[PDB]
Amino acid sequence: STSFKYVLSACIASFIFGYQVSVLNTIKNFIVVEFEWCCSNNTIQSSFLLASVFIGAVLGCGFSGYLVQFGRRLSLLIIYNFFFLVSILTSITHHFHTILFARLLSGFGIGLVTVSVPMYISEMTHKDKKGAYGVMHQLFITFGIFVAVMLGLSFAKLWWRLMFLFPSVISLIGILALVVFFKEETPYFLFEKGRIEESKNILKKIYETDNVDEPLNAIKEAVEQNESAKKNSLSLLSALKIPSYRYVIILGCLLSGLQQFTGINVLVSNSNELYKEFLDSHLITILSVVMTAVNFLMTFPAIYIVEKLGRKTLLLWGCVGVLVAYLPTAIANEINRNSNFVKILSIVATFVMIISFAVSYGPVLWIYLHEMFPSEIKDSAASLASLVNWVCAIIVVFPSDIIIKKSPSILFIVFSVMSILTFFFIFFFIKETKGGEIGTSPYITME
């Protein structure tokens, strides 16, 4: 219930993230519209904006990896302030050359969110139920996206400026709630700096029990593992020289990369404008809305199954969904385009695909990315995994856009291939961490 509240704050952060994703999707769609219309400055400003935001997201993720060592909650507050100031300065829209740096810092804050949130949620909750709360994180991401989309609905441009203004209010709510209600950092990091009693206190607050014994012992084992890592001078590059460390790191990075390879949002947005079949634009908007609603409403059964079944199994079922969705899509689109059956199949299979991909892939990916890494090397590995996540995010977004301009068959069949390979990968190289202790892995024993 209390952990539910901490997770609620991190879910305000996730809400901001979701909004940023959605307004980025509307931005790209608008730019593409005007680009189809026309013939220099537009492409330049757009390219600079997207590039700056994206590299800002990646660098922001790496620098989030470096910053999260200073504090998790402090990082969250830095995020809130960043999004506050940036959203304000962008919503003003008086300054012409400031908007670029605004997009840059915005991306920075976004990456900061990406790295910071799942760790904070994972370390602030119960060992068994941490997953469900990670699913709550993803849930408020999707909720943020949906809220933004539905909020979309020279005066309408001022309304758009208001759309730019809203994140300032949301961030302000986040700052207020967080600072006022909870001043406590994670028990893990409290015990990391050498402070035992504060960690024990906040742990007593979380577990709602005077006995912190077993969790305190786990955290103690983690800290001792960190000190032992400091004794041998273990680092990221040093982890690359040891087969086990590079094994689990490669597993994580490739897992996240395969999560991005699915090409979810890109498929949603590209296929949304791909086959209109001369249907009303209102029907297209409705398609996008019900797709987002589908994302959320399928986001909840994610918490259901993660609570019940486990980690890897759900991933397998999701890969099944994506496969069954993409294969007939690939075949039918390979046959002929501009066909009714091809269009309907594309839409329905897209629905099944987004349901399954959300409910299976998203939360489980983030949570497992948090859990799979040992306390010896965790933050750097996860941060680099998110870095690879954003790189693969670009590798998905832009080339899938140029290819969907070229022809859909390529994108569909390569996404299908990457999906099957994702199934085989998750089944073969990944083990279930369910009921796992903090800072441990099923792959490696002690030292």
Ligand SMILES: C=CCCCCCCCCCO[C@@H]1[C@@H](O)[C@@H](O)O[C@H](CO)[C@H]1O
């Ligand atoms: C139409 C889109 C315009 C181009 C967008 C460029 C910014 C990249 C967005 C990264 C999306 O990544 C999310 C992923 O991290 C996961 O949390 O789930 C989400 C879905 O639920 C994924 O969209």
